[PDB]
């Protein structure tokens, strides 16, 4: 019998080498929890998985971007609430000042409060801020803006929407002349009567701006709910491609582990087989 | 001679060297042609405000605003006349008592006054725009041109009249004092009459609020000076009107014997 070489040992070692590599690949999938770990497992699957992972991070960030946009809209709408009450107060004061029983001094005492209210309207317009950006001064208007406000509410390049906020000072409300800068007065009964109409126009402008911001807020609420829905579906799609089945992978791991034991047992048999003819 | 006949401030078109320099500047500008260029440093671009083209454009903007204001005033006057004619010419089948006619006349006066005030406010807005446009012509030589003086005088006069008719008397004083420094405008007695009224209003407002005596004396002296000047310009010196105004001012002012 041939003793120079052991072909049976070579075959048993070749089988053992291949199954040992299959065991290593099963350990990688079990310890990391991912079906695809290195290039060569599933190149097409990895490319789709990594594209989905970018979308999942983008959708989650886009959802965060939307809520920040809602915060800015909510913040801006809060400032106009104070502006609305002041103009209502001027409007009730103008009805009283329009009556004929008062004198010049009583109407001047009404104008004393009217001046404070106009100044407070101007102050609100000047100091309304979100993250150090003025909102009510006219920067984000439509006609002659100095800046634009876009909310990036998607995960891709051009998925952004625009928001407009008009000027909300005394001049923009028709309560102050934009060229001369004199404002409304209640010190005369005739002037008080015409102020009543001016307050009505001012209130309509404020009511219109609040409706616009409420419209902006409602749309962002729908988008944020949709982005969360999109995020859940995409992550489920990514998991189905990338994440390994632990129960199924454990079965593969056990099969290869036993195959290694059988190959090792037979390899020890092939080495001893050669000694038979030495007797 | 009409200084506004051409509707322009200065006519822009001679030396051979100047023509050569202009040609070389044009050739230089051709090489560096870039309409998208925007100067980060504004000084060199703001040098354009001293040129003739900038002054012509601003002059025509001011002229357009001034014409709009004058149009407002004249159209309102025509409307008032036509409205009075129409109100007089229409039939009143339910008007049989005198007090009803009195009430109708009062209603017409109310309507006319409201329309007049509205027109005055709009014209004043236009005239203020014209003043702002004329204020930013920074060439001292171009501000010395007869056309500039004519337009400035017209705009100042219209603004003063509108602001006075809106009962904003103190605001007209700086404009009047600027107005009487142009050409021989100091020799027009209406300006001094307006100044006398406005300074009288200022003195009365100081007296009413119990303000400082220095301001009261200053306003009274200015009012008396401009009243006497208006009297002399319209009626002549050593005239009975002049003597009467002298007596009134002597009574009004503080003197020491």
């Amino acid at each position: 019998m041939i003793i120079n070489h052991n072909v049976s040992a070579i075959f048993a070692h070749r089988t053992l080498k291949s199954n040992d590599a299959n065991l290593s690949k099963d350990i990688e999938k079990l310890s990391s929890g991912m079906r695809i770990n290195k290039a060569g497992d599933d190149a097409s699957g990895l490319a789709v998985s990594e594209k989905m992972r970018t979308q999942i991070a983008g959708l989650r960030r886009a959802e965060q971007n939307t809520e920040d946009g809602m915060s800015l809209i909510q913040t801006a709408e809060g400032y106009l609430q104070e502006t609305h009450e002041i103009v209502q107060r001027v409007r009730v004061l103008a009805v009283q000042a329009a009556n004929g029983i008062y004198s010049e001094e009583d109407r001047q005492q009404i104008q004393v409060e009217v001046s404070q209210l106009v100044d407070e309207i101007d102050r609100i317009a000047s100091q309304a801020e979100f993250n150090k950006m003025k909102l009510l001064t006219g920067a984000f208007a439509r006609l002659n803006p100095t800046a634009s406000m876009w909310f990036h509410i998607g995960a891709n390049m051009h998925q952004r929407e625009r928001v407009y906020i008009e000027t909300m000072n005394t001049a923009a409300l028709g309560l102050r002349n934009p060229t001369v800068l004199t404002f409304i007065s209640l010190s005369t009964a005739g002037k008080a009567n015409s102020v009543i109409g001016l307050c009505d126009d001012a209130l309509r402008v404020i009511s219109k701006q609040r409706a616009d911001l409420g419209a902006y807020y409602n749309r962002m609420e729908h988008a944020a709910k949709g982005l969360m829905n999109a995020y859940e579906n995409t992550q489920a799609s990514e998991s189905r491609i990338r994440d390994t089945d632990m129960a199924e992978q454990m079965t593969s791991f056990t099969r290869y582990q036993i195959l290694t034991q059988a190959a090792t047992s037979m390899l020890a048999q092939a080495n001893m087989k050669s000694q038979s003819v030495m007797r | 001679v009409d200084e506004l006949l051409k509707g322009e401030l200065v006519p822009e078109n001679l030396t051979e060297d100047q023509k050569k320099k202009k040609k070389e500047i044009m050739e230089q500008e051709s090489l560096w042609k870039n309409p998208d260029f925007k100067g980060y440093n504004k000084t060199f671009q703001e040098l354009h405000q001293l040129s003739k083209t900038f002054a012509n454009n601003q002059f025509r903007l001011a002229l357009s605003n001034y014409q709009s204001g004058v149009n407002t005033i004249m159209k309102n006057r025509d409307w008032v006349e036509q409205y009075r004619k129409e109100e007089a010419e229409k039939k009143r089948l339910d008007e049989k008592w005198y007090w009803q006619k009195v009430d109708r006349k009062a209603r017409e006066e109310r309507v006319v006054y409201r329309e007049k005030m509205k027109a005055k406010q709009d014209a004043l807005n236009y005239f203020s725009k014209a003043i702002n446009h004329l204020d930013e012509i920074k060439n001292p030589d171009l501000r010395e041109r007869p056309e500039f003086k004519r337009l400035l005088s017209d705009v100042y006069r219209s603004w003063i009249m509108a602001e006075y008719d809106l009962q904003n008397l103190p605001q007209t004083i700086p404009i009047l004092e600027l107005y009487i420094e142009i050409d021989d405008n100091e020799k027009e007695y209406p300006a001094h009459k307006y100044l006398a009224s406005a300074y009288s209003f200022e003195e009365n407002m100081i007296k009413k609020t119990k303000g400082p005596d220095d301001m009261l004396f200053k306003y009274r002296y200015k009012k008396n000076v401009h009243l006497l000047r208006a009297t002399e310009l319209k009626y002549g010196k050593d005239s009975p009107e002049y003597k009467h105004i002298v007596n009134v001012i002597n009574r009004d002012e503080v003197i020491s014997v």
Binding site: - | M26, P35, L61
Partner: protein, 225 residues
């Protein structure tokens, strides 16, 4: 076109004292200058020696954006009428028959300060009335940023640059530049200025009618007592 005949009907304004004008409109009467390039305003606007009509309308760059008040630039459109022969001895402008037009010059100007862009276009018709087709005596000039110099002739080597008579342009079916110009610009421009002249006449006659009515009202006012 026959509008050139109509432009001879505006000789009535020569002896008509113009006091009412449209917004941002300039009109004056004068004599031809050296070489007959433009109209020089006369000291007396009612003399019979006046032989030219100058009508100009100006606007502002950025007016279509509502930004005229920002002083972004200047633009205006004007054209000048030139006549020959002294005007009649009678001073009445109401009865005036058309006279012969020596030349018709149109001028389009635009200057954008922000872009440093200046464009000037000039059309001169030195044979206005006499032939329905006088393309050889119609001068077209285009100047951008003061280039080319004023009065620069056009050479056939460099076509489209410099002062070129209308006969130098091609009028093929492939490129009907002659026909496109005539149909689009020239007819409308001449009609616009003719209608402006007629509107000026209408307003300055309504002025006299209003004066007569005002005198009638003043006289009627004395019947109440």
């Amino acid at each position: 076109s026959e509008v050139n005949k109509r432009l001879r009907l505006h000789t009535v304004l020569f002896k008509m004292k113009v006091r009412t004008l449209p917004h941002k409109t300039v009109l004056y009467k004068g004599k031809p200058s050296a070489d007959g390039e433009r109209c020089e305003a006369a000291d007396k606007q009612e003399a019979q020696d006046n032989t030219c009509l100058h009508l100009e309308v100006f606007d502002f760059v950025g007016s279509e954006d509502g930004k005229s008040s920002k002083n972004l630039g200047a633009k205006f459109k004007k054209m000048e009428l030139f006549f020959e022969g002294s005007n009649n001895a009678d001073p009445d402008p109401r009865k005036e028959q058309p006279r012969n037009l020596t030349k018709i010059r149109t001028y389009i100007y635009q200057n954008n300060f922000l872009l440093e862009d200046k464009v000037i276009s000039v059309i001169a018709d030195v044979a206005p009335n006499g032939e329905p087709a006088h393309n050889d005596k119609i001068e077209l000039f285009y100047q951008h940023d003061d280039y080319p110099v004023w009065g620069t002739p056009e050479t056939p080597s460099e076509k489209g640059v410099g002062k070129y008579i209308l006969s130098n342009v091609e009028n093929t079916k492939s490129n009907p530049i002659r026909n496109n110009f005539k149909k689009q610009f020239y007819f409308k421009n001449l009609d616009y200025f003719d209608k402006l002249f007629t509107k000026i006449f209408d307003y300055n006659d309504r002025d006299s009618n209003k004066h007569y009515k005002k005198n009638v009202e003043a006289l009627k006012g004395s019947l109440k007592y």
